[PDB]
Design an enzyme around this catalytic site. Structure first.
Site, PDB file in Angstrom:
ATOM      1  N   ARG D  44     -24.338  90.221 -96.277  1.00 39.55           N
ATOM      2  CA  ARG D  44     -24.592  88.779 -96.262  1.00 39.55           C
ATOM      3  C   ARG D  44     -26.064  88.408 -96.416  1.00 39.55           C
ATOM      4  O   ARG D  44     -26.388  87.336 -96.925  1.00 39.55           O
ATOM      5  CB  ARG D  44     -24.062  88.172 -94.960  1.00 39.55           C
ATOM      6  CG  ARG D  44     -22.559  87.966 -94.921  1.00 39.55           C
ATOM      7  CD  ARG D  44     -22.131  87.380 -93.584  1.00 39.55           C
ATOM      8  NE  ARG D  44     -22.101  88.392 -92.531  1.00 39.55           N
ATOM      9  CZ  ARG D  44     -22.002  88.119 -91.234  1.00 39.55           C
ATOM     10  NH1 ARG D  44     -21.931  86.860 -90.823  1.00 39.55           N
ATOM     11  NH2 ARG D  44     -21.977  89.104 -90.348  1.00 39.55           N
ATOM     12  N   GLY D  45     -26.948  89.301 -95.982  1.00 32.63           N
ATOM     13  CA  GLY D  45     -28.358  88.986 -95.824  1.00 32.63           C
ATOM     14  C   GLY D  45     -29.144  88.465 -97.015  1.00 32.63           C
ATOM     15  O   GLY D  45     -30.274  88.009 -96.848  1.00 32.63           O
ATOM     16  N   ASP D  97     -35.586  99.212 -96.495  1.00 37.23           N
ATOM     17  CA  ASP D  97     -36.021  99.695 -95.196  1.00 37.23           C
ATOM     18  C   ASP D  97     -36.003 101.224 -95.146  1.00 37.23           C
ATOM     19  O   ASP D  97     -36.983 101.880 -95.508  1.00 37.23           O
ATOM     20  CB  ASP D  97     -35.116  99.075 -94.129  1.00 37.23           C
ATOM     21  CG  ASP D  97     -35.646  99.238 -92.732  1.00 37.23           C
ATOM     22  OD1 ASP D  97     -36.875  99.150 -92.533  1.00 37.23           O
ATOM     23  OD2 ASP D  97     -34.825  99.434 -91.814  1.00 37.23           O
ATOM     24  N   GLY D  99     -33.848 102.880 -96.908  1.00 35.92           N
ATOM     25  CA  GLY D  99     -33.543 103.212 -98.285  1.00 35.92           C
ATOM     26  C   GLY D  99     -32.130 103.722 -98.470  1.00 35.92           C
ATOM     27  O   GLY D  99     -31.678 103.895 -99.598  1.00 35.92           O
ATOM     28  N   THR D 101     -28.713 102.592 -97.752  1.00 35.96           N
ATOM     29  CA  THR D 101     -27.660 101.805 -98.390  1.00 35.96           C
ATOM     30  C   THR D 101     -28.001 101.426 -99.829  1.00 35.96           C
ATOM     31  O   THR D 101     -27.147 101.494-100.711  1.00 35.96           O
ATOM     32  CB  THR D 101     -27.365 100.519 -97.596  1.00 35.96           C
ATOM     33  OG1 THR D 101     -28.593  99.841 -97.306  1.00 35.96           O
ATOM     34  CG2 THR D 101     -26.657 100.850 -96.290  1.00 35.96           C
ATOM     35  N   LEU D 102     -29.248 101.037-100.064  1.00 33.05           N
ATOM     36  CA  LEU D 102     -29.677 100.611-101.392  1.00 33.05           C
ATOM     37  C   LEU D 102     -29.668 101.776-102.382  1.00 33.05           C
ATOM     38  O   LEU D 102     -29.467 101.578-103.582  1.00 33.05           O
ATOM     39  CB  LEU D 102     -31.069  99.979-101.322  1.00 33.05           C
ATOM     40  CG  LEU D 102     -31.434  98.952-102.393  1.00 33.05           C
ATOM     41  CD1 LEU D 102     -30.293  97.979-102.623  1.00 33.05           C
ATOM     42  CD2 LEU D 102     -32.684  98.203-101.976  1.00 33.05           C
TER      43      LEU D 102
HETATM   44  O1  LIG Z   1     -36.723  94.341 -88.779  1.00 31.71           O
HETATM   45  C1  LIG Z   1     -35.397  94.142 -89.099  1.00 31.71           C
HETATM   46  N1  LIG Z   1     -34.744  93.007 -88.655  1.00 31.71           N
HETATM   47  C2  LIG Z   1     -33.421  92.800 -88.967  1.00 31.71           C
HETATM   48  N2  LIG Z   1     -32.792  93.736 -89.714  1.00 31.71           N
HETATM   49  C3  LIG Z   1     -33.436  94.827 -90.136  1.00 31.71           C
HETATM   50  C4  LIG Z   1     -34.739  95.051 -89.840  1.00 31.71           C
HETATM   51  N3  LIG Z   1     -35.071  96.271 -90.437  1.00 31.71           N
HETATM   52  C5  LIG Z   1     -33.974  96.706 -91.048  1.00 31.71           C
HETATM   53  N4  LIG Z   1     -33.075  95.837 -90.841  1.00 31.71           N
HETATM   54  C6  LIG Z   1     -31.756  95.971 -91.349  1.00 31.71           C
HETATM   55  C7  LIG Z   1     -31.742  96.875 -92.573  1.00 31.71           C
HETATM   56  N5  LIG Z   1     -30.457  96.860 -93.189  1.00 31.71           N
HETATM   57  C8  LIG Z   1     -30.175  95.548 -93.702  1.00 31.71           C
HETATM   58  C9  LIG Z   1     -28.951  95.577 -94.605  1.00 31.71           C
HETATM   59  O2  LIG Z   1     -28.667  94.260 -95.014  1.00 31.71           O
HETATM   60  C10 LIG Z   1     -27.301  93.900 -94.867  1.00 31.71           C
HETATM   61  C11 LIG Z   1     -27.230  92.469 -94.405  1.00 31.71           C
HETATM   62  P1  LIG Z   1     -25.961  92.227 -93.136  1.00 31.71           P
HETATM   63  O3  LIG Z   1     -24.613  92.149 -93.784  1.00 31.71           O
HETATM   64  O4  LIG Z   1     -26.235  90.946 -92.391  1.00 31.71           O
HETATM   65  O5  LIG Z   1     -25.988  93.378 -92.173  1.00 31.71           O
HETATM   66  C12 LIG Z   1     -30.432  97.804 -94.261  1.00 31.71           C
HETATM   67  C13 LIG Z   1     -31.302  99.010 -93.935  1.00 31.71           C
HETATM   68  P2  LIG Z   1     -31.479 100.129 -95.384  1.00 31.71           P
HETATM   69  O6  LIG Z   1     -31.272  99.334 -96.653  1.00 31.71           O
HETATM   70  O7  LIG Z   1     -32.859 100.746 -95.414  1.00 31.71           O
HETATM   71  O8  LIG Z   1     -30.456 101.229 -95.303  1.00 31.71           O
END
Ligand SMILES: O=c1[nH]cnc2c1ncn2CCN(CCO/C=C/P(=O)(O)O)CCP(=O)(O)O
Ligand SMILES: O=c1[nH]cnc2c1ncn2CCN(CCO/C=C/P(=O)(O)O)CCP(=O)(O)O
Ligand SMILES: O=c1[nH]cnc2c1ncn2CCN(CCO/C=C/P(=O)(O)O)CCP(=O)(O)O
Ligand SMILES: O=c1[nH]cnc2c1ncn2CCN(CCO/C=C/P(=O)(O)O)CCP(=O)(O)O
Ligand SMILES: [Mg+2]
Ligand SMILES: [Mg+2]
Ligand SMILES: [Mg+2]
Ligand SMILES: [Mg+2]
EC number: 2.4.2.8
Lengths: 172, 170, 172, 170
Positions: D44-45, D97, D99, D101-102
């Site tokens: 969603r983000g 972040d 890395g 999931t992406l």
């Molecule tokens: O500082 C933060 N505040 C809130 N959320 C944070 C923060 N750092 C990572 N995240 C979440 C990182 N997540 C965010 C994934 O976005 C998905 C949006 P949602 O469906 O709301 O959980 C992914 C980490 P990566 O891509 O490196 O595997």
């Protein structure tokens, strides 16, 4: 929606005997593996094959399902797996292999999750229609270029509940 | 997950015989309908029951599945592939229990206005009931036992057992 | 796939001003409620409306999305909500209301989960095409019987990224 | 959930100005492609970031979304609606972040053989990186701070903030 009839190609007893043999082969190959095992069925047409096959697989495993479907469209995931397959012996269970397009992509997708091993078991195979070289480790029947129904396989959403494999014969 | 073992409660011979009778009942109920019929299975636990049951139903029908969220809201992880409007619908479940999820699923499907809407469960636990949902076809009424097999799992195990087994804790 | 052109119906500034007002009205109605609040957007065409509207809603709420779509087919759920809505103030956010068929069913589905309250906010409304009496509490614009694009709304998957509401005009 | 408060880190004025520059960059990169373009947002983000960004992209493109499972397997809760084969694809994320999931999403989409495949993230945390996935367009590089707003949540809160706020624990 065309006038037709259904003729038996593979009797119920023939299928049961074949799946019993498939069960022995699959059991022999995965019995000595120290990792967990998953049977992945491709909805919708493989629910019946899966039900009969897993009962013949004498190895402690899990049962999961995913739903995918494709001019020439991309293979998209409508329903993904419920469980993780990383580090597990995965056996894909499909009802029939025509062109090989769909199953080729599905295998690619699942391989990204790095399972211990990845293999395919299809009940029916129609080699005359193959368009992509896909390795299939287990095959129930290699069948002629007929349009088959029954045993989960449908024609216009019809005949899935047939305990045998029949072929659609058009009239007129 | 705990230290345990599994013993047979309902042999596959008795399951097969019971489903044969269920098929005759369902066939009797829906033979003269004229409207299209469809069996809807609730994944994952009902796939094996669906495969054996629909082969015992001697009426032209379609086979569909949906996956529901399993208090919390009953949400749909995967909806039906086909329409059910004006059709005779038979929901196929492995075990009715508290009645929660099956009650919500019936409400959701009813909104799509099918001609009829009935439920067929392999196992029933009358004691654990929280919502009085009508079930038309029941395979076995069992006491409140920890059962596995025939699609029913325990920590993703024993789904592939041809029989209904009871889990014995050690 | 027909030759056409796009003419402005609702300028970007007009939309921003309207959503600002919608924000005030929604805020006023839900500011004194003691329960949690959810804005539910109907993918795909309502992502832009949702993004601008929720920034104008001065009430602590959650943002969620669901994906539904319908001869005369049933409204099926392709993607359900992530969060529960039971006992919460739910506001459905849609881009446009044509016949009212889809939104009528979606409201029925969400109502089964027994939220504290249930309401609808659509950016565009085309009353000349209404086939079902559906209560809409908040409406951005009531528009003539034109085929509109832009602001998340598409024509053959095109023009979603337009910051304004335009109308498709055919040629020849 | 803990006792906390939220203060502004990146005002909506600075977010808007940065996205304007991002739009010019993306437009420059894809203007002379000729092939169809599509922005893919990870729900969603990324919905708010998507809405503002695509309005700043002066190139004819489509808008699609997918929802991924969020070690454990990256699974697809909702796939794309349209095809991406032979198209220029720009994945739109709120924050890159670790890395993880992406990186998986990029692999999955690459199998569908698009003409090009790039990633645009609003926020980047270089320090938390576990998988080296290439990101072409970055809005802000931030230290390892607990940030919310603009689609980013904390226990399903503050998604609707027009600014990027920092969560202060008490
Ligand atoms: O500082 C933060 N505040 C809130 N959320 C944070 C923060 N750092 C990572 N995240 C979440 C990182 N997540 C965010 C994934 O976005 C998905 C949006 P949602 O469906 O709301 O959980 C992914 C980490 P990566 O891509 O490196 O595997
Ligand atoms: O003879 C046939 N009868 C019914 N269906 C047939 C037949 N041949 C191919 N198909 C279609 C099978 N397709 C999809 C069939 O599987 C899904 C069944 P359903 O969900 O009921 O439409 C896959 C072939 P490939 O792996 O080469 O991409
Ligand atoms: O004795 C049991 N052994 C194993 N499972 C049991 C047992 N009792 C209930 N359950 C699970 C009941 N659940 C089973 C739901 O079936 C879904 C199959 P799955 O996708 O594998 O979780 C539903 C309870 P209700 O319909 O009353 O809301
Ligand atoms: O003028 C129009 N432009 C584009 N689409 C239009 C228009 N009118 C109706 N529609 C279709 C809207 N439909 C579905 C549109 O929403 C989904 C947009 P997308 O996922 O991009 O196809 C709902 C009307 P109702 O609530 O009466 O069932
Ligand atoms: Mg298949
Ligand atoms: Mg069940
Ligand atoms: Mg809409
Ligand atoms: Mg994200």
């Amino acid at each position: 929606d065309m006038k037709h009839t259904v003729e038996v190609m593979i009797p119920e007893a023939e299928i049961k005997a074949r799946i019993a043999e498939l069960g022995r082969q699959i059991t022999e190959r995965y019995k000595d593996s120290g990792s967990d095992m998953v049977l992945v069925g491709l909805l919708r047409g493989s629910f019946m094959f899966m039900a009969d096959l897993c009962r013949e697989v004498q190895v402690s495993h899990e049962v999961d399902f995913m739903t995918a479907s494709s001019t020439t469209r991309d293979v998209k995931i409508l329903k993904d797996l419920d469980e993780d397959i990383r580090g597990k012996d995965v056996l894909i269970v499909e009802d029939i292999i025509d062109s090989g397009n769909t199953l080729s992509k599905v295998r690619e997708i699942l391989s990204l999750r790095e399972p211990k091993s990845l293999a395919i078991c299809t009940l029916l195979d129609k080699p005359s229609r193959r368009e992509v070289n896909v390795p299939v480790e287990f095959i129930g029947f290699s069948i002629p270029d007929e349009f088959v129904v029954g045993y989960g396989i449908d024609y216009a959403q019809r005949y899935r509940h047939l305990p045998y494999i029949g072929k659609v014969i058009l009239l007129d």
